[PDB]
Structure formats: structure tokens, C-alpha cells
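In practice, a research group might receive sequence data for several interacting partners and want a quick structural hypothesis before committing to experiments. The following worked case mirrors that situation: the sequences arrive first, and a predicted assembly follows.
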Amino acid sequence: KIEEGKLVIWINGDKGYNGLAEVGKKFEKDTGIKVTVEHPDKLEEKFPQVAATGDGPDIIFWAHDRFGGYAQSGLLAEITPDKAFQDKLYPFTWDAVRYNGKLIAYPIAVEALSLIYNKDLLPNPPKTWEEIPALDKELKAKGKSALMFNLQEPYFTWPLIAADGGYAFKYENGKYDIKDVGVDNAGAKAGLTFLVDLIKNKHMNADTDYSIAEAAFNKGETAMTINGPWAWSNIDTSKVNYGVTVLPTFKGQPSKPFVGVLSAGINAASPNKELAKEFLENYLLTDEGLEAVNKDKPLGAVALKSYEEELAKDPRIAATMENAQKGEIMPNIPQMSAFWYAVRTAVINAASGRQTVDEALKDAQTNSSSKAEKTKQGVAEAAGKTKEGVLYVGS
Ligand SMILES: OC[C@H]1O[C@H](O[C@H]2[C@H](O)[C@@H](O)[C@@H](O)O[C@@H]2CO)[C@H](O)[C@@H](O)[C@@H]1O
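A structural hypothesis for the assembly, expressed as C-alpha cells:
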């Protein structure tokens, strides 16, 4: 079971887990309650499997889009912040963590992708996706490339898919309609086709992942990348002279990144819900707590009004918020896991040439709109049926 009287926290390995551990250590010094921060791989897939049995961490950090599914499954606790606490965070961030009328996590920070570029290689970054091939040809003549970003997670390609009309779920008459999906409309197809054409024409490689893109950009080998605020820390260390700015347009339309609110959910099986509330409200969601995490890896535009008033002065946060305004806050509905798996499969398959864009996105539409020792006992029932009446075992 989960251990009473301590806290275990999971957070993704791209975030400021060392800074979060500093907050945990302060909490322990003050209250005697040990706090252990972990960053497992694939935590967003591990959590629902282990929480189903009452195991897992006390607190899970992820963007809010996964949390409605966890809540529907009974894996996240309703939280109980009072009115004065709620007043400390922006109303729109509370909206992101509301599911079936209930608050099911504490919002931490607003994440949007931006275009990150090397000012020495590219003092003037491209306004449009369309001009990137010509820019790549120029840079290749100098032993560089124009653009590298993670092609294994559809989060990074979504802004281009959505630019000219792609969408996840239609919102109408007060709700998201899971039978009205926008992953295979003309705009979505156009965006993915453009990415695939970049690859076919050798301006990008289908196998490029988070680490490959980050290494290339930070080594000064590629002029641009697409990433979130957490990435800025390593670029600071790299000493690349970088800027953070608005994503390129496609067909003249803004790229529309899906915006995530990094949020802290409490395991519904935790015996430490009160401890988790104290930690999150009175240690983490304070200027000093968020600063500790932010100094490790930038959070983005934080949900905490007092600290955001400081971070807002950062032009990189200004760029983050411009991209956020052009994009959309993700739904939190349970169907989001199906949507993301479907689009992940489509992007990887189209990029690698395993499927055409039309084939891949048709499949994504179908799966996106398809609604998302018990074993020992079932085997036993089936065995018992073979022994009913005068039936016998064995010949
Ligand atoms: O690629 C699909 C993936 O997108 C989002 O995950 C982001 C996450 O929001 C960020 O915090 C950061 O970790 O990068 C991830 C992309 O690799 C969704 O939140 C996630 O549910 C979805 O599977």
C-alpha cells in the first residue's frame, strides 16, 4: 500500500524535480514528514495502472489533460481548497482542473510551446512554416539545419496540425462531442502533410526525438527547435544565443499549440490527503516554493498570481503566453488519452512512411471517436462449466 505519514511525488523528468525536492526537504524539516520526489519514465501510463490497485504516488504532476480520465476512473481525489486559497490562482487555471463540477487537482503552471531559435545562425526567424525548406537548404550549405524537434510525441506537431483547422473534439451546446473529431479534416491533413513533406525532402528526420533535437539545438547544429519553458534551462547552460518567439504560421494562420496546465493531483487511495494538501497549498504554491522549482526548470506562466506578476516580465514568458493565446487549453475529458494515442500513432506512421497521411489520419479519426485475480476467477468459472452435470474432466 501507499505509506502513511510520508509523501511520494511523481513528476516528469523534463521538469524541475530537483527544485521540487528542495521544497519537499523544507516541508520535512518543518513538519517531520518525509517527501520523496521521483520521475519515472512514462509516469502518465504507469499511474493509472498502479493507482488502480491503490498503489502509486501520493501526488502526481502532469498536464491537466490526463486528469479527467484519472478522476473518472476513481484515481484522483477531489481537493478541498478554501475560497481564500482559490483566490490566489487564476480562475482559468482552476477551470482546467474542474471535472464533473469538482476540483480534481491543484493548477501549477501554464505551458505552451514556442519557437526557439539560434540568433547567431538565424537573427530573423521565419514567420511562416512555408519558408523553412528554403532556409534549410541555405543552412545545409553551411553544415547546419533549419529545424529539429521531437517527432515522437504528437504534442509538438499538434500546433501545425491545428493551424489550418485541425481539432480534437468539437465543443458545442455546453460539452465536447466525442463523435465530432477534427483530426482528419482538410486542415489537419494539410498540416501533417507539410511535416511529412519536410521529411521526404530531407529537411527533417522521422526518428528525431526529444533528446536528439535538444542535443542538436544546444550544440548549435540546428537553427531552431520547438519546445516548452522547461527546456530553457539547458539552453542557458549551452550558451547558445537563443530567442523564444511566436511559432510560424501555416497557410497564413497561427500555429495553435494545445496548452497544458501542469497540475498536481492527489491519489484517491492516499492515506495522506491532508499532508498533500498542506504541502501543495502552503509550501509549493507560494512564491518561494514555485521559485525553487522554476530556478531548476522554468514552469512557464504560473497559476499563482503573486509570482506570475514577476514572471510576466520575462519576454520568454510573454512569447509563451502569445502562443498560448493563439492555441487552445486542452480538454480534460477522459477521451483525451484515446485522442493522443491515436494522433501519436498517425504522426509516427506518416512521418516514417509506414502509412500515408490520409490513411493514418483516417485511423486516428476512428480511434479518437471510439469511446475509451479477476483473471484467475474468470478462468475458474470457465473450468467449472466443463464439470457441470455428468460432465467429467479428462478423457
Ligand atoms: O504528445 C502527447 C502528449 O502531449 C502532452 O504531453 C506533454 C506535457 O503536457 C508536457 O508537460 C511535457 O511533458 O511534454 C509532453 C509531451 O511529450 C499531454 O499532456 C499528454 O497527455 C500527451 O500524451
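Before designing any experiment, note the following. The first strand starts at residue 6 and ends at 10. The pocket of ligand 1 is lined by residues 12, 14, 44, 63, 65-66, 111, 153-155, 260, 262, 340 (CB under 6 Å).
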